Amino acid sequence: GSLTEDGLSYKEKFVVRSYEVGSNKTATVETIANLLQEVGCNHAQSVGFSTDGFATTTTMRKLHLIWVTARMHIEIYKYPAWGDVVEIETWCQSEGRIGTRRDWILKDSVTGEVTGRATSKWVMMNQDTRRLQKVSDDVRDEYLVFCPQEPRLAFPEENNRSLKKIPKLEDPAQYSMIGLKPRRADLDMNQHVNNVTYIGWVLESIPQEIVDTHELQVITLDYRRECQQDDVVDSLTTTTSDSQFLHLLRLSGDGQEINRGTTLWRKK
Amino acid sequence: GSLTEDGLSYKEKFVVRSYEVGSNKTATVETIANLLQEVGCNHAQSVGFSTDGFATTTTMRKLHLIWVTARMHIEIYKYPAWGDVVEIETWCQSEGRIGTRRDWILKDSVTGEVTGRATSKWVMMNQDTRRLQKVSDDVRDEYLVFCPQEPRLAFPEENNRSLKKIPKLEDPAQYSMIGLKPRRADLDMNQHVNNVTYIGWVLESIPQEIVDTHELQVITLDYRRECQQDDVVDSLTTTTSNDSQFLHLLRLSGDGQEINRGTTLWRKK
Ligand SMILES: CC(=O)N1c2ccccc2CC[C@H]1C
Ligand SMILES: CC(=O)N1c2ccccc2CC[C@H]1C
Residue A26 included in any domain: yes
Assess whether A51 and A147 both reside in one domain. yes
Nearest to A121 by CA among A72, A74, A81: A72
Contact (CB<8Å) B38/A19: yes
Among positive and negative, which fits the CA dihedral B123, B125, B127, B131?
A: negative
Whether A166 and A248 have beta carbons less than 8 Å apart is answered as: no
Q: What angle do CA B171, B176, B179 make, to 5 degrees?
A: 110
The domain boundary, picked from A130, A163, A196, lies at: A163
AA letter at B158: E
Domain stop point among B132, B163, B194: B163
Regarding whether B253 and B156 lie in a shared domain, the answer is no
Same domain flag for B149 and B204: no
Residues 6+ apart with CB under 8 A from B252: B227, B231, B232, B233, B234, B259
Q: Which atom of ligand 1 is nearest to the CA of A93?
A: 11
Contact B181 A179 (CB under 8 A): yes
Cα–Cα distances in angstroms (integers) from residue B265 to residues A222, B212, B216, B225, B245, in the given order? 41, 14, 6, 24, 5
DSSP percent split of chain A into helix, strand, coil, nearest 5: 20, 40, 40
Same domain for A201 and A118: no
DSSP 8-state secondary structure symbol assigned to residue B228: P
| Claim to verify: residue A200 and residue A245 sit in the same structural domain | yes
Distance CA A177, CA B182 (A): 12
Answer yes or no: do A159 and A179 share one domain: no
**Do the domain assignments include residue B170?**
no
On whether residue B87 sits in a domain, the answer given is: yes
- The candidate with the shortest Cα–Cα distance to A16, out of A43, A34, A3, is A34
Q: Is residue B169 part of a domain?
A: no
Interface size A-B, in CB pairs within 8 Å, comes to: 79
Secondary structure tally for chain A: helices H, strands E: 5, 12
Q: How was this structure determined?
A: X-ray
Check whether residue A92 and residue A197 sit in a common domain: no
| Distance from C-alpha of B132 to C-alpha of A111, rounded to nearest angstrom | 45
Q: Which of B227, B242, B248, B260 is catalytic?
A: B227
Same domain, B139 and B182: no
**B156 in any annotated domain:** yes
In this structure, are residues B163 and B220 in contact, taking their beta carbons and an 8 Å threshold? no
What is the three-class DSSP state of B161? helix
Q: What is the CATH number of the domain that holds A254?
A: 3.10.129.10
A149 and A200 in a single domain? The answer is no
- Total domains, chain B: 2
- A221 Cα distance to chain centroid: 8
Instruction: Give the up-direction half-sphere exposure of residue B118: CA atoms within 13 A in the CB hemisphere.
Output: 27
B147 half-sphere exposure, CB direction, 13 A CA radius: 21
Cβ atoms of A221 and A202 within 8 Å: the answer is: yes
Strand partners, B221: B72, B262
Asked whether residue B159 is assigned to any structural domain, the reply reads yes
- A170 belongs to a structural domain: no
One-character DSSP codes across B53-106: SSS--HHHHHTTEEEEEEEEEEEESSPPBTT-EEEEEEEEEE-TTS-EEEEEEE
Choose the catalytic residue: A192, A194, A195, A214: A192
DSSP A187: B
| Best CA proximity match to B256, nearest among B229, B236, B228 | B236
Alpha carbons A147 and A93: distance in angstroms, whole number: 5
**Residue A201, domain extent:** 175-267
Annotation marks residue A190 as catalytic: yes
CB-closest option in B42, B51, B200 to A183: B200
Cβ of B22 and A189 within 8 Å?
Answer: yes
Q: Are residues B28 and B133 in the same domain?
A: yes
Best of A10, A19, A50, A199 to mutate (most B CBs within 10 Å, chain B) = A19
Distance A47 CA to ligand 1 centre (A): 9
Final residue before a domain boundary, out of B126, B141, B163: B163
**Cβ-Cβ contacts under 8 Å, B19 against chain A:** 34, 37-38, 188, 194, 196
Chain centroid offset of residue B168 CA: 20
Please give the distance, rounded to the nearest whole angstrom, from the Cα atom of residue A160 to the centre of ligand 1: 24
CB–CB of B204 and A211 under 8 A? Answer: no
Tell me how far apart the alpha carbons of residues A150 and A8 are, in angstroms, rounded to a whole number.
Answer: 11
A140-177: b (≥16 Cβ within 10 Å) or e: beebeebbeeeeeebeeeeeebbeeebeebeeebebeb
Q: Ligand 2 mean position to B41 CA, how many Å?
A: 9
- Both A136 and A37 in one domain: the answer is yes
In a domain, B111, yes or no: yes
Cα(A44)–Cα(A105) distance, integer angstroms:
17
Judge if A40 and A81 occupy the same domain. yes
C-beta A79 within 6 A of ligand 1: no
Q: Let me know: does A162 contact A155? Beta carbons within 8 Å.
A: yes
Say if the Cβ atoms of B204 and A183 lie within 8 Å: yes
Q: Looking at the DSSP assignment, which residues form a beta bridge with residue A10?
A: A3, A90
